[PDB]
Design a protein around this nucleic acid. Structure first.
Ligand code: ANP
Ligand code: ANP
Lengths: 559, 560
DNA sequence: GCCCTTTTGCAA
DNA sequence: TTGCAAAAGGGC
């Protein structure tokens, strides 16, 4: 409980304040060392700061010639330690560099950096204890502090706790090369949130079919299995286009009672039941792809509801839908003029075609509804977009919280349009509902480099304006250089694993200043599960961690 | 009132002169210190300058070895403040570097930089007093000077005040990261202006439904609640397409007397009363698009006034409107040929269509071009919200009344962009027409400015360029300096910058304004909420940190 | 984004 | 039958 060394300098180096430290022969012989990246406590005029050891080098102290002294001692076979204690007391020194991150304020928020530079004769450096480290961090264990693989740098009793106030309404980045634990960390965080704070909903853009169920050895279990193990019931809603296959897999991997944990829903709708929905999708495709809508589509989009009362116009619309190539359910009847036809049968379909208001233009241009074949399935009668919107922002659903997983791969090549439409609809509804209830849901999207780019930027709008409505993002990109700076600069949290490239670390430092002190560690130490966590404004400095395996988390939390 | 240290050097570092300062051990022991970014007064040849503390470092003075001395003292375990004062007295020095921003001359005008380099022997540095700082800032508090979160570096008695000369007629910028106080600062400025100078009109292009009512604990209260607290009556005009819902909210929050503070109007009009408005909107829509509106549309737009006197042409126009989809009110009559139909009924409409020219027939045939107008149509309104807003802002009856206009853009849906562009064009044209008879004297609040100031041909771009002549101000927030063109950034007069994380943002800011080169490190390193770097031209052409105030505290203080 | 084609409808 | 206007899909 005394200073490690003696401070012999200080300065302002860029936007940070440093101070040099010297370790004397006594402290070096006793066995006191300092690991690079360690956190120390600096006292200057009665105040306690937080420092991080950056560098370390050897330099002569006083008027000495260490090279000559050591070379001569080696030549003469003179054992310095046992024979010349007075010669081992004038070369045994060592310098260090320390950077003042900020000052911890009691009952308040960590004050970053410092505008005051301490004189040399009024600064001390004390090693930090476990209680102080816990007070620094804590102010459901998600990981514990650890400095590299060095012995004595592991602190299993210092942990970082998951808290909805850290993730809800704020963007979180997740970087790290392949096989280093991004998905495992995401699963751990989501499981802990769902288990501890059941009032938070999530929307998962499952791009790789790895979240609901995972059985290969190349990754940890999935959310469905985790929920079953933890005892969470009736919180997962799964939307897929392969309902039967996924139900078979779920039954196999969860037993005969899988329906108590997962609700499987289809991504199909009978467009002969929602012609207005079909028109809206066709009209919105143009806007979502840059260009402006045609007038013959604007007119229909605005007037279809009125058209519904004119049987002839409705017959025109249904004929356009059928001519597009959408197979109807067996037993449909049209009423052109005052005669009932059967578009399901080829004979009556041709009769109606030859027997046959803006609906005429729609029938002529019905070659534009062909892209809707992906989402069309006869006899469904369930608007999945409305179902998702109600699940996420229902009046009564407030509180309980729901987890929504979308099986994007099952949608073929329409996944991009479907995701853009869903995001636009959800954000518009959230903006409308402002003041009546907060959205309070978290958007999870892996391979975010794909989604964070478009015309009109639905995801740009979500990232840059979701804070007010409690709409938080948590994206994994695997390479910082692939994310636009316009979105990188708006990210509050960070979770960076090992990054091999140099451009990646340079971009990370450029986007977030405090990440310049760990670039060398990231470059040189390829360790799996080792992450540097940064959280504004509660913990505005980089801290290393050893993330926990999902199996271990489940086993520990079962009790 | 004694020099803090001793000047021991000076030079011309690039375009700025600088000089080094030394703090002696006696002063260091007394407790004197200098904070980075602090403002100090420099005396040289009978003229006082204004300097900023830039850097600080430790360097040995004289023939000494501080490293060896301190290491030996530590080894021998001798307290360095009670046992060996003569050894502690030769290593307790410290250097500072100071930059001269300029000197104030005549009536507060700021002479920039300096062509004269002061000799070391006759240059002194005095700490600046509260009176001097107040004079510096001055020539209804908005924020008090503060140097970071360092205790002892805060001056609650030094404030920057709100004055229409600062804002109206000049462009202001409001940058910062997401969640740091841009909206709160905007609301503070607006509330102070509306409480102090009631002859300044505003136009808030609301985009998130936050400037009228705000109850969620994620932003400061709304302007409606602020006005209710401050006792300002009959000054807010709300334009929205959700009259009933907003009336419910106002009733449930402002109380039962809410109609005194907020006046609600709808964004819907009946186009059967303003066919000229319908045709003008349809014609303007395409021009705001690519270009070259069709000849028939041009002809209709120019000659509808003449058409008004011909019932046959007007019947063709009304038939076109009805065919587009717009619903007329019950009991409408059309005089075609020599007959009076009732287009509100199916059979009458069919008969008229069967019965049915200088340009009206082509419009009737191409009736699908008016479909988009169904996003504004509501039978039985006869309001012309565009004209009403024009009278509210640039009306000749006001000559100073104070009118706060808030537009609920989200309610419109996908027509908000076109509506905003058309309204801005109309307002600017009217203001240009009014030049030489009366000034507009109003401010245009704009949020998410990067959406509007992108294209060089935009009406918002032209307003930003040419509004000062006619008295039209601006105040835009964008969250990122990199998203605004340099052409606008250079010409902007006022700045209010919060924490910025990206190096590109700070580089852009310093490229646009040279004096912002001394605060890049602070911006990058300190993520403080509510901390602002204000720079106002031309009276205060240097960066001064502030501590913006919460709207709740501003209200509670102004009540007295 | 930008630049041609095809089609319909109303002259003549 | 031809010429001209105006809207919407293709290629690059
Ligand atoms: N904290 C950890 N401790 C130990 N092993 C871990 C840890 N995190 C991950 N792993 C191992 O790393 C493997 C890959 O994890 P994974 O979550 O797929 O990384 P990843 O970021 O998703 N790579 P990828 O998503 O394919 O780009 C797992 O199967 C584990 O064996
Ligand atoms: N000067 C201040 N002092 C204390 N809290 C503040 C101050 N300014 C803002 N806040 C708080 O900071 C949060 C964000 O407020 P807000 O003004 O909406 O920031 P913002 O910049 O408008 N967010 P954004 O529109 O995305 O940039 C709220 O909780 C405010 O109460």
């Amino acid at each position: 409980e005394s200073p490690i060394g003696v401070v012999v300098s200080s300065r302002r180096n860029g936007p940070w304040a440093e101070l040099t430290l010297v370790l004397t022969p006594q402290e070096l012989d006793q066995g006191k060392r300092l690991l690079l990246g360690e956190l120390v406590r600096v006292s200057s005029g009665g105040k306690d700061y937080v420092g991080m050891v950056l560098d370390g080098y050897y330099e002569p102290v006083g008027r000495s010639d260490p090279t000559y002294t050591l070379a001569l001692a080696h030549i003469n076979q003179v054992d310095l330690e046992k024979e010349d204690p007075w010669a081992r007391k004038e070369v045994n020194f060592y310098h260090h560099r320390i950077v003042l991150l900020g000052r911890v304020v009691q009952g308040g928020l960590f004050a970053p950096s410092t505008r005051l530079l301490p004189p040399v004769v009024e600064a001390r450096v004390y090693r930090m204890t476990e209680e102080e480290l816990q007070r620094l961090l804590a102010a459901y264990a998600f990981g514990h502090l650890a400095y590299g693989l060095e012995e004595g740098g592991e602190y299993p009793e210092v942990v970082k706790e998951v808290d909805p106030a850290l993730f809800v309404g704020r963007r979180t980045a997740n970087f790290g090369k392949t096989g280093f634990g991004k998905s495992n960390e995401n699963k751990v965080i989501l499981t802990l949130l769902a288990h501890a704070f059941p009032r938070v909903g999530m929307l998962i853009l499952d791009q790789n079919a790895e979240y609901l169920l995972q059985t290969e050895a190349t990754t940890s279990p999935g959310l469905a299995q985790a929920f079953k193990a933890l005892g969470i019931r009736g919180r997962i809603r799964f939307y897929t286009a392969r309902e039967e296959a996924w139900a078979r897999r779920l039954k196999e991997h969860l037993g005969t009672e899988w329906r108590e944990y997962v609700e499987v829903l289809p991504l199909k709708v009978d467009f002969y039941h929602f012609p207005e929905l079909a028109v809206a999708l066709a009209y919105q495709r143009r806007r979502l792809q840059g260009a402006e809508p045609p007038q013959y589509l604007e007119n229909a989009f605005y007037n279809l509801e009125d058209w519904k009362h004119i049987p002839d116009r409705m017959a025109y619309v249904y004929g356009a839908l059928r001519k597009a190539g959408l197979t109807p359910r067996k037993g449909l009847k049209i009423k052109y003029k005052n005669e009932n036809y059967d578009i399901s049968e080829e004979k009556s379909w041709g009769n109606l075609q030859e027997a046959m208001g803006g609906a005429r233009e729609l029938y002529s241009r019905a070659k534009v509804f062909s892209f809707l074949r992906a989402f069309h399935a006869p006899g469904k009668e369930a608007n999945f977009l409305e179902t998702i919107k109600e699940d996420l922002l229902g009046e009564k659903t407030e509180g309980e919280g729901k987890v929504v997983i979308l099986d994007l791969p099952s949608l073929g090549e329409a996944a991009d349009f479907f995701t853009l439409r869903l995001m636009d609809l959800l954000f518009d509804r959230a903006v409308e509902l402002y003041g009546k209830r907060q959205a309070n849901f978290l958007v999870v999207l892996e391979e975010a480099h794909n989604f964070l780019e478009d015309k009109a930027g639905i995801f740009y709008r979500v990232a840059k304006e979701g804070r007010k409505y409690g709409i938080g993002m948590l994206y994994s990109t695997q390479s910082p250089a692939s994310i636009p700076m316009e979105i990188l600069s708006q990210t509050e949290n960070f979770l960076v694993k090992h990054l091999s490239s140099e451009e990646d670390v340079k971009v990370l430092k450029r986007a977030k200043a405090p990440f310049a002190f760990v670039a060398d560690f990231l470059l040189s130490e390829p360790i799996i599960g080792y992450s540097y966590v940064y959280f504004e404004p509660y913990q505005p400095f980089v801290v290393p961690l050893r993330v926990k395996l999902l199996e271990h988390v489940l086993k520990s939390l079962d009790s």
